[PDB]
């Protein structure tokens, strides 16, 4: 269960950053080191918890992202327009070239 | 795929506006217009609105179960063969959810009686009115005022009651008491404190006429220069520089990913009696997304950024960041120390602030144009020395400033007469050829232009840069000191800004000659 | 020589309160020349103590 | 090291030289960092391992970084008449780590100035935002612009470098 | 609570029609304090202030009370605080009662992010009487710069970004360094306050208690009157008369006043014109004192007489807080001309010295050896390295770290 936080680059200046918890299931664990910046594709589900309802006093639910893929964008923030989960991954034709 | 539409009636423009102090429990269930300064906003969580349960056996669907402050669920199954009094499985897909945000507003500063602490309130925002009240902004909420019970006492499937006058005796309560808390429920909130075609289509025809008169004008450039900061007498060169600053250049990005700066930085160095702070105040009060700050470093966060431990680390936004995509009017640029100047060397050229302090590491964005105002060393400007001598700034930071404007209060008996007549004249009442609201739309229209360099413009630009470097050559080894390739990029930026002033999409060699004059006048100061 | 002396309104208030205390020790309304002479002598001696040796 | 706010014990978290492990760490304005901050990369730049023994946490992290640092000579201008040690505030222990030390001089040559100005103006024209569907037409335009200056495409250069490294 | 009227309007007309209204108000400001005639006058004008012109123009009076430590520097502060409707007495050094600046606090109870306003804000229209202005921290000195310049306090902390309207009046009173104020030394060298902060005050009165038996006899007799006291003046009517004048009266400046003012400024400047006497900030402040004097007496028109009254006040203040050959730049800059000549001589002496030496280089100690010994008198050491900074900027000499230093 990795905890995404809004990137300081995309946070509006002077505002507090929002954050959502992200569940990494099998084969996705240990793929995002702490402090790195990543792009998470996944289902945006919500589950009911009594603690949140008690705290806020309204029938409010807690949301969470079940990650389906992760691409790290830390250290390649100028690499927009590229395709794939790994910009540096090469196909067989690329290796032949 | 029918999608039921839930409506939200919004009432606004109430005859009277209440306040946090004027809250009374006798107004519960009534429309108010509470106004206060927001200090904290929660996340946009989805709250259950119209639940739809499916019982665990016989799969019967209980639907449109209205929800109270609790997690109320149906008690009985419509099918007369299902045994279910506490067992259901909510259908999340079928249920209807609503955006829910809780803002923590407080009393306005001017409404707080002396000594008394401000009174706070918790205002619930639902639907489209979510995220419309940012912290710090004074908003004028309006909606029903309700009272929120303690749902812990009411009993919840996942928690237990936790330990001022609480009533009791309810069937669902038993022996525990119930306490109530007043909380506003806002239905409408307002704060009280781009291609060319896209911009044009968003402008009314009457404004389109005024803009058409400007763009077709012959002396539009000089009129704009004279219309910048009308309350300041003289200083046409500084007015022109400030005008070119707002237009800016083109923030180009090359194929290799390297970003080329498009913002123009000005430094108005002048004697202590001059009108530097007036220019800075006009710019901060006119240009959108602009801030005013001094070199005294008021806040703990510097001009750029800082990390503060929470009793984890978080980033405090500095002055150079709050003015992103705008103008950062820095005052007293000399007062801020040399150990502070090294922080903005990157923020003024690469336009990013890179922080790696402790567990936090980010490359923050500062796409700002700096309008500094530095007093010369020794208080009064000394014309016997070059601009380098009169300023404590070093070469790396002095080369990042596009324009240097030197303004002096020469002891002229006549000039003081016009100055005094002007200041006293203003305090008594300046006729600008373009009013502020009228000029703002012209600047917005001109910013949509992205001028390009013609073929002869490139040759003229290269020749002018060669002349600049030839005239700046110093030393036996011919080592340029004041003029680097940053000056060539500065000529390009000023040419683009000038072409935007004339609202022309092509850069002519006349514009490059004018930009060369603007740079030359800032370095021939000997 | 040391500037820690320039008699100040506060020295007058201290003199008045010292004289009041001295009379307060000796019956009532004893504040006369006899009391103020002792009070000023004490004040001057204390000032001279700062200039000892 | 930090005290974990939830479990309340000391835990170790990496910094720039760990987030850049088996990569590159870029230090702009090298000469302007504090000396007691600049000396902290002596071990990780030669031994390539960060040794931490604070708050009862005795461990040696691994940081196989490759520092690329941009400096600035004393006084803002590189004085060619003085040795290297007299132009920088850095000392021998940190100057010996750098395998290649490139000295950049900003001289005045009319031919060189002309060529550099021509290149810069051409690059500014090329990078202008106003310069068979949308996607592959845009890709074709990007390749057309790239082929002018870079003999090998950048999107292939990154993969080439990664393949050679790994 | 154990703790506006037509007749009130008649009383206002009665007091306003009095010829001696100005002196009467001056006396009523600080009845228990003797002398200090002009200080009470300036404080009275501060209570009214200039017209709040809109279209930003301050339209307010900022007064600093310097001089050697003065009990009145505090007594008259409490008096004016009691007199002014709004505002709050605050100590700059301590700031125990009020923090003097708006900062976010966690109120503990519910641990919420409550924003509490400082002393500056909440005193709009009122006078925020500062005390111990010299010993206040640098961080709050920057806040004072912002409030007197920008008129608003902007906060960006804990996700809250906002600007708070201050619109306050500053009446500070700072004790000097050392045992007592030294009249011979300039005000900057005695008060320990940055020149930009000192130049922001319209009227800065140097309240001194210099020794002389002639004045001391009368002062001590008046003091003994106070001792014997305890064992016409509108004492309280003025605290609402000021509000009535602030609301009902909106002074407007006329053309004769315009000509008189322009003339006054040009005259002040020419008094000395190489040096630089007055500045446009002082011109705008005079525009403020004349407006305040018209606001008082309930005439709502800035007639000619108020102009030279304010000019006299400004000229007396300048003659007080500036040196004997009144400069008007030492207050705006620690480096005075009689000081600036020292650096301009040292820089060239250093240039020529290093030149004749190469005829090569040395660290700081050797440079001191040939400067303070025989080149001139025993001058201060840091001035030499300060002029070395100007020489570095001119690129005449190069400093090789902590040690030697040569010329290119
Ligand atoms: N050309 C001018 N036109 C209008 N007002 C001027 C002009 N020159 C000076 N002033 C006035 O002079 C006063 C002081 O100018 P400022 O803009 O405050 O400069 P400054 O901030 O005082 O300079 P320093 O070095 O920070 S003290 C203001 O009231 C200005 O309106
Ligand atoms: Mg200023
Ligand atoms: Zn059922």
From Swiss-Prot, chain A:
Coiled coil: none annotated. It is found in: Nucleus. It comes from the Eukaryota. Component of the MCM2-7 complex. The complex forms a toroidal hexameric ring with the proposed subunit order MCM2-MCM6-MCM4-MCM7-MCM3-MCM5; loaded onto DNA, forms a head-head double hexamer. Present with 1690 molecules/cell in log phase SD medium. Early fractionation of eukaryotic MCM proteins yielded a variety of dimeric, trimeric and tetrameric complexes with unclear biological significance. Specifically a MCM467 subcomplex is shown to have in vitro helicase activity which is inhibited by the MCM2 subunit. The MCM2-7 hexamer is the proposed physiological active complex. Acts as a component of the MCM2-7 complex (MCM complex) which is the putative replicative helicase essential for 'once per cell cycle' DNA replication initiation and elongation in eukaryotic cells. The active ATPase sites in the MCM2-7 ring are formed through the interaction surfaces of two neighboring subunits such that a critical structure of a conserved arginine finger motif is provided in trans relative to the ATP-binding site of the Walker A box of the adjacent subunit. This is DNA replication licensing factor MCM2. It comes from Saccharomyces cerevisiae (strain ATCC 204508 / S288c) (Baker's yeast).
Curated annotation (Swiss-Prot), chain B:
The modification Phosphothreonine is found at residue 454. The modification Phosphoserine is found at residue 116. Residues 220-424 form the MCM domain. Its EC number is 3.6.4.12. It catalyses: ATP + H2O = ADP + phosphate + H(+). One of its GO terms (molecular function) is single-stranded DNA binding. Its main location: nucleus. GO terms for cellular component: CMG complex; cytoplasm; DNA replication preinitiation complex; MCM complex; MCM core complex; nuclear pre-replicative complex; nuclear replication fork; nucleoplasm. GO terms for biological process: DNA replication; DNA replication initiation; DNA strand elongation involved in DNA replication; double-strand break repair via break-induced replication; mitotic DNA replication; pre-replicative complex assembly involved in nuclear cell cycle DNA replication; premeiotic DNA replication. A motif (Arginine finger) lies at residues 399-402. It is found in: Nucleus. ATP binds at residues 270-277. Keywords: ATP-binding, Cell cycle, DNA replication, DNA-binding, Helicase, Hydrolase, Nucleotide-binding, Nucleus, Phosphoprotein. Belongs to the MCM family. Component of the MCM2-7 complex. The complex forms a toroidal hexameric ring with the proposed subunit order MCM2-MCM6-MCM4-MCM7-MCM3-MCM5; loaded onto DNA, forms a head-head double hexamer. Interacts with MCM10. Present with 13400 molecules/cell in log phase SD medium. This is DNA replication licensing factor MCM6. It comes from Saccharomyces cerevisiae (strain ATCC 204508 / S288c). The chain holds residues 257 to 838 of 1017 of the full protein.
Swiss-Prot record, chain C:
Signal peptide: none annotated. ATP 2 binds at residue 10. It is found in: Cytoplasm; Nucleus. Component of the MCM2-7 complex. The complex forms a toroidal hexameric ring with the proposed subunit order MCM2-MCM6-MCM4-MCM7-MCM3-MCM5; loaded onto DNA, forms a head-head double hexamer. Interacts with CSM1 and MCM10. Present with 166 molecules/cell in log phase SD medium. Acts as a component of the MCM2-7 complex (MCM complex) which is the putative replicative helicase essential for 'once per cell cycle' DNA replication initiation and elongation in eukaryotic cells. Core component of CDC45-MCM-GINS (CMG) helicase, the molecular machine that unwinds template DNA during replication, and around which the replisome is built. Belongs to the MCM family. This is DNA replication licensing factor MCM7. The gene is MCM7.
Curated annotation (Swiss-Prot), chain E:
Residues 21-224 form the MCM domain. ATP binds at residues 67-74. A motif (Arginine finger) lies at residues 199-202. It comes from the Eukaryota. It is found in: Nucleus. Present with 8800 molecules/cell in log phase SD medium. Early fractionation of eukaryotic MCM proteins yielded a variety of dimeric, trimeric and tetrameric complexes with unclear biological significance. Specifically a MCM467 subcomplex is shown to have in vitro helicase activity which is inhibited by the MCM2 subunit. The MCM2-7 hexamer is the proposed physiological active complex. Acts as a component of the MCM2-7 complex (MCM complex) which is the putative replicative helicase essential for 'once per cell cycle' DNA replication initiation and elongation in eukaryotic cells. The active ATPase sites in the MCM2-7 ring are formed through the interaction surfaces of two neighboring subunits such that a critical structure of a conserved arginine finger motif is provided in trans relative to the ATP-binding site of the Walker A box of the adjacent subunit. The six ATPase active sites, however, are likely to contribute differentially to the complex helicase activity. Belongs to the MCM family. Component of the MCM2-7 complex. The complex forms a toroidal hexameric ring with the proposed subunit order MCM2-MCM6-MCM4-MCM7-MCM3-MCM5; loaded onto DNA, forms a head-head double hexamer. The gene is MCM4.
